[PDB]
Write a protein that binds this DNA or RNA. Structure first.
Lengths: 78, 92, 96, 97, 104, 91, 81, 96
DNA sequence: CAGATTCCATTCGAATCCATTCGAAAATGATTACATTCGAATCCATTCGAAGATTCCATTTGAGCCTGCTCGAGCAGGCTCAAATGGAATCTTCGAATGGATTCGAATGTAATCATTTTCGAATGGAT
DNA sequence: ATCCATTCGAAAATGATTACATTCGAATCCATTCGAAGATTCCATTTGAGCCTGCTCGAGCAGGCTCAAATGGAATCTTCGAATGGATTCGAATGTAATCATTTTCGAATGGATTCGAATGGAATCTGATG
């Protein structure tokens, strides 16, 4: 399912970042980095969900997990 | 019921820019910003009171928390505004 | 004769007093002029940010305010950029 | 036939994708990936739409910042092409490695 | 007679003092259960024992009898989890010797 | 008079290594370490209690707060030790 | 007191570089090092003096420095806590 | 006359200063610098000795870490000499 | 072959561990309320299935712009030595500043009774 | 054309005023640590100057490899619609944490006796550099 983050999507993100030329081995590295970040955040989101004896992951769990990580986000209830 | 800072943000906006509106998402962002700053100031004031073996929180704690947290040239104006408000409150 | 009107503000003083009283450990008291100071600080910061965003909107020839304007205003000022390091959902990036 | 030199369309794409504010990864693949990752921690989970939206916004911001630092590292070594070693150096200096 | 709570739990760190310390950090109207102190004492004792064991091994390597901040730094920075948890500066530790291969 | 964690640190050390001593600066470092970890756990527990609109603090809050801020196998072993201690205490 | 930043000599910077692991050093490194040191010291000392002034004192203690360092994100073990 | 090729004594000092634990700056010049810097915030201050020693320890640790990052950046560009560009890039990536 | 670094011997001096007096605080026992847990009753809001026009994506080809390797010149940092300098270190005195006690006097919380004030319903004409 | 930002009406929290009761933190005095200012030496550390070598920079070639364009065609998006699953609220009945009053066990500060690492004094290898 990590192969559904295609090559044009990475090209678009790199273009918005300011990159002019891209190598050919960048895509696997980017996929690994994204997977690590996502796992780190979802672990804490699920911990927050489990403490409250719920079965649904809400937006507030994600907001709290991000604020814990040091990546505060504005516009989603906090 | 659910309390928020929408009415006061709208009042301030009508005070500064009398001809401009604001959408919903910008309002949500402003609410998040206000809550964040308030929590920061309150935590720092509690720590300051703890360090000195006090129990009451006064305007000295708030002034020092503002001096510690806000960058320069933003602390001067905030301190002046707070001092003016407190003096006007006491005199009246 | 409300406390906010006596101090000359728009943000609430009673509500901020109630909020401050609930974060003061055990057996902790809160003065009556801490609320006035806090309300003044919050109102000042809000007015500054709104003024910058409205100036940007007037530059862009629109009437309302969108998260794009807030991101443009915050990223263009050194002090506001230093104070606010969060993510504005719907702003993008500053061209460079 | 008309052809373009390599390097101008890249600048056009840079301007186009820096002037906008939309999202750049498609939604269904990201949703599937998020669910698959989260199934390792607990089985039979449910999500809200706002949770997936928050995760997508955070991920995109992180990747864009990383690519800016990578470009700085690539320029340092007298190149215009970014390679994996630049990503590794940026992540090592930042504190993630 | 009287039996201390740490003896009932089977620990060394104090349960009564930690309970008294926890009750002083609760915001406004806040109560603290009697089994939060047991959990906290157990956690602190476990972490202390782990760090002390690693430092003692590092000291034993150098044929020295006592423990000094140098051994604490060597023990902490050689473990991945302890390095990740503790990011503070140890006054008297120095740096772990490491020379790049290109310079040699 | 002032409080410190010196007695218990020395007891644990004599439990682990029965023939190795400690100096006086390492004792100060251990004191600072213990205080830091305690303050972290207490703050996280207070926030967790606040989120769910409850006033009391229990071992559930402490267990969840340990599951955060503790990496890898440290979290598993710490949770095991705490659970064993509580189970022995209540009985 | 004037031009006291020149007491951070060139041998001292060379020793700090050697402990950092540096084999060769350029000739313009020393001024950059002095500038960065001055900036760091100014920030920390400003916060420490604020902490001292709040307590209505005239002597700067070790705990003000420890608190300021914890504020900046540079916790230090050994001098209090 | 006996001479050493350029680069051997450098490794000897690297090992010597990485094996030890003491401080590397003189104490009197640093204390004078601290007092002069603090002159601008409040006149007629007093310092304990522990305050000065804490400041010295923190400063030394900061500089050593910065030099490690600078060496990484210098190795990236296929060099063994460190230059101001490496310091600037290292401080820029760390968000300083 | 001349320099530098790792081993063992010996006497010394700074440093740790054990012993004592006693205050600050922890464990026991009743008595109260306060907060958390255990059943129903709506009723939103997440998951699953279907249809399809279209727009993103994947594959192949051609070629020229970017990167990598070799070579020569020069230039800027390392190494050694003599002369001068400013830190360390060991007392002496003095004076500026905390920190602890004992009264007071300013200021906050608690309890009732109003008299506001903000949040929840639709309703439209207006920037995008 | 279409989505949405500002108004209008009511009702249930919830601030604002008066009157104590009492924590709590200013105002003066007194001790003592503690930091600042002087004075006098060795001796180790810093500062220039000369010499020479190795590392950095720039130029001419050659091979590698990323980008731009055209053709299928596939799979993300939008709309519709049941089935039902799980958060959320309202009551009684419990579980347990707080608050006094005693009694005594425990940990903090001050003294005193080994003892174990911190400077010398060497000897034995290890290694580097020119031949």
């Amino acid at each position: 399912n990590i192969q559904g983050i295609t090559k044009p999507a990475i090209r678009r993100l790199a273009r918005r970042g300011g990159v002019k030329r891209i190598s050919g081995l960048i895509y696997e590295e980017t996929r690994g980095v994204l997977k690590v970040f996502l796992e780190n955040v979802i672990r804490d989101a699920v911990t927050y969900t489990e403490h409250a004896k719920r079965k649904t992951v809400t937006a507030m769990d994600v907001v709290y997990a991000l604020k814990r990580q040091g990546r505060t986000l504005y516009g989603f209830g906090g | 019921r659910k309390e928020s800072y929408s009415i006061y943000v709208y009042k301030v906006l009508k005070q500064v820019h009398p001809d401009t509106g604001i959408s919903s998402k910008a309002m949500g962002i402003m609410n998040s910003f206000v809550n964040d700053i308030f929590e920061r100031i309150a935590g720092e004031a509690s720590r300051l009171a703890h360090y000195n073996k006090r129990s009451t929180i006064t305007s000295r704690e708030i002034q020092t928390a503002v001096r510690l947290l806000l960058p320069g040239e933003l602390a001067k104006h905030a301190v002046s505004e707070g001092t003016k408000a407190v003096t006007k409150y006491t005199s009246a | 004769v409300s406390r906010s009107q006596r101090a000359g503000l728009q943000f609430p003083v009673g509500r901020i007093h109630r909020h401050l009283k609930s974060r003061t450990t055990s057996h902790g008291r809160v003065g009556a002029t801490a609320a006035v100071y806090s309300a003044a600080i919050l109102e000042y910061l809000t007015a500054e940010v709104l003024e910058l965003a409205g100036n940007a909107s007037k530059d862009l020839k629109v009437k309302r305010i969108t998260p794009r304007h807030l991101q443009l205003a915050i990223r263009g000022d050194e002090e506001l950029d230093s104070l606010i390091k969060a993510t504005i959902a719907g702003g993008g990036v500053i061209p460079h | 036939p008309h052809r373009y030199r390599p390097g101008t369309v890249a600048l056009r794409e840079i301007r186009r994708y820096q002037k906008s504010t939309e999202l750049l990864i498609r939604k269904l693949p990201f949703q599937r990936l998020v669910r698959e990752i989260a199934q390792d921690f607990k089985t039979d989970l449910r999500f809200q739409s706002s949770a997936v939206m928050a995760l997508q916004e955070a991920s995109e911001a992180y990747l864009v910042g990383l690519f800016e630092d990578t470009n700085l590292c690539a320029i340092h070594a007298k190149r215009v092409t970014i390679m994996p070693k630049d990503i590794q150096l940026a992540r090592r200096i930042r504190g993630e490695r």
